[PDB]
Amino acid sequence: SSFSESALEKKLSELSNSQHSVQTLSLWLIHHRKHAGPIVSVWHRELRKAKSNRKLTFLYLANDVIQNSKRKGPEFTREFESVLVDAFSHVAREADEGCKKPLERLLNIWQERSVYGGEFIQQLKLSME
């Protein structure tokens, strides 16, 4: 594809955790490095909309692009710097919440079925916060 924000959004929607998926999209982004500003902006917006279990993969793409871009120029390293603090903060919180979801679901089952009383369920809930 030619570079466009629509093409990048579609490619990001399909980004998976495979080595090949990350590598392929990284190569395309480097081939269109003149558009590093828009690329990074779209990347950042789509990260935030992504399902919690796909968020780390966005940071892997960043890793790939930033590392592989060094031999071409400092554009991506510089562009990403403006958004990476927010990205890491966001993924840290989300991956935490995401990894606790099965535990919350279990407590919700326990409450629905009165496996224990509400006061004890609340104590368990608090112990994960």
């Binding site: 080595q19 590598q23 993969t57 790939d64 590392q67």
Partner: peptide, 12 residues
């Protein structure tokens, strides 16, 4: 396939 590894780029 292999899952992505972030040490895979050759940048040192």
């Amino acid at each position: 396939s292999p899952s992505y590894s972030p040490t895979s780029p050759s940048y040192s």
